[PDB]
Amino acid sequence: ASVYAWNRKRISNCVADYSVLYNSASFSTFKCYGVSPTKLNDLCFTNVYA
Amino acid sequence: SALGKLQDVVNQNAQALNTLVKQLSSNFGAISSVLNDILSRLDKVEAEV
Numbered sequence: 001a002s003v004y005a006w007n008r009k010r011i012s013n014c015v016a017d018y019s020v021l022y023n024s025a026s027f028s029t030f031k032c033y034g035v036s037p038t039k040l041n042d043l044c045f046t047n048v049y050a
Numbered sequence: 051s052a053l054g055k056l057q058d059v060v061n062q063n064a065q066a067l068n069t070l071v072k073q074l075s076s077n078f079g080a081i082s083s084v085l086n087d088i089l090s091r092l093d094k095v096e097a098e099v
Contacts, residue, residue: 035091036092036097039091039092042090043090
């Protein structure tokens with residue numbers, strides 16, 4: 001999406017392996033602000049919004 | 051109401067202990083006051099801060 005009309009996808013009813021994201025050669029930054037990316041696989045969330 | 055001295059000494063200690071327990075729920079600027087939230091969410095170098 002554009003910046004002004006930025007797009008939200010709600011994510012629900014799944015298992016997600018965040019290591020598959022974090023280890024991806026694609027990403028130039030992966031900064032996190034209250035969870036460390038190594039710890040994501042130990043957690044479960046009431047909602048996730050991308 | 052005659053025993054106000056002794057019942058106040060009991061109340062002061064109960065209020066002191068309940069204040070000390072309720073202060074476990076205070077953040078003091080941490081991301082959570084529950085110590086297991088920090089240790090489950092954050093890796094060592096961030097968690098220590």
